[PDB]
Amino acid sequence: ALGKLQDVVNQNAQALNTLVKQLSSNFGAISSVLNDILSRLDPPEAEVQ
Amino acid sequence: FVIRGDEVRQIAPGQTGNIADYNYKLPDDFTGCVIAWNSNNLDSKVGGN
């Protein structure tokens, strides 16, 4: 019966999870971590990714 | 200034090397023109210039 509320919660929570998971995607970059790119490439090269 | 032929590539935005790092560095957002011309007849001596 309470689904209408529970559902809502899940939706919001789901979105946040998705958002956070989007921090672990390459999007075409060499890596998904900014620190790794900065440490492994010079700024002129790193900025591209 | 005066450089050697192999270092001509170093005079450009987003370049690394001895000349770029320690002698003359151009900004990444550099706006202008680089003109390099051989000066062998002017800056070369038999005993070494």
Provide an overview of this structure.
This is part of a larger assembly, with two copies of chain A (49 residues). With 49 residues, chain A is an all-alpha fold. Helix content of chain A is 61%, strand content 0%. Chain A has helices at residues 3-21, 34-40, 43-46. The longest helix of chain A is centred in the N-terminal third of the chain and has 19 residues, at 3-21. At the A-B interface, helix 3 of A face loops of B. Chain B: It comes from Severe acute respiratory syndrome coronavirus 2. Chain B: Residues 4-6 are annotated as: Integrin-binding motif. Chain B: This is Spike protein S1.
What value does the Rg of chain A take, in angstroms? 18 Å
Q: How many β-strands of chain A, per DSSP?
A: 0
SS-based structural class of chain A? Answer: mainly alpha
SSE order of chain A? HHH
Instruction: Give the oligomeric state of the chains in this entry, treating copies of one chain as homo and distinct chains as hetero.
Output: part of a larger assembly
Major sheet details of chain A: none
Q: What would the principal axes of the Cα set say about the shape of chain A?
A: rod-shaped
Q: Span between N and C termini of chain A?
A: 49 Å
Largest interface: A-B, 5 and 4 residues
Task: Note the beta-strand portion of chain A.
Answer: under 5%
